[PDB]
Design a protein around this ligand. Structure first.
Ligand SMILES: CCc1c(-c2cccc(OC)c2)[nH]c(=S)n(C)c1=O
Length: 134
């Protein structure tokens, strides 16, 4: 076993707060905000050795990232940014930093009771997205 074990599984979005405002701060345009904001993604998290995979599947887009903690990678986001990402584990929280165009956003994923809570921060704007087991 590894501590990342508690993230593994299939998760479904059950609530979202302030996500439109977060998307605006990121620079997402109107039509993508509207359609992306409707989506109810599932997130599939798995681990094989040192490699963590996070798949997100929705009616809007499907995405997949695979990575090693602390090792930067290329990511194309659901809203089509080409970003450089680094994901670390800080005190049991997965911390995902995306950098593009001189900008940065941080996505934190944590287990809280039976939920997986996702906090997305762009400058002063935070969105909270709650997932439960599928
Ligand atoms: C903008 C991408 C994004 C989504 C998301 C939103 C809509 C559809 C979708 O399809 C896979 C994914 N969800 C969360 S929780 N975070 C942290 C994101 O960065």
């Amino acid at each position: 076993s590894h501590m990342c074990d508690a993230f593994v599984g299939t998760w479904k979005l059950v609530s979202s707060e302030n996500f439109d405002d977060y998307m605006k701060e990121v620079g997402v345009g109107f039509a993508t905000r509207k359609v992306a904001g409707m989506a109810k993604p599932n997130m599939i998290i798995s681990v094989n050795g040192d490699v963590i995979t996070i798949k997100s599947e929705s009616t809007f887009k499907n995405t997949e990232i695979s990575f090693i903690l602390g090792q930067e990678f290329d990511e194309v986001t659901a809203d089509d940014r080409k970003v450089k990402s680094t994901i670390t584990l800080d005190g049991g929280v997965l911390v995902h930093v995306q950098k593009w165009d001189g900008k940065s956003t941080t996505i934190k994923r944590k287990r809280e009771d039976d939920k997986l809570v996702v906090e997305c921060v762009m400058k002063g704007v935070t969105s909270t997205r709650v997932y439960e087991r599928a």
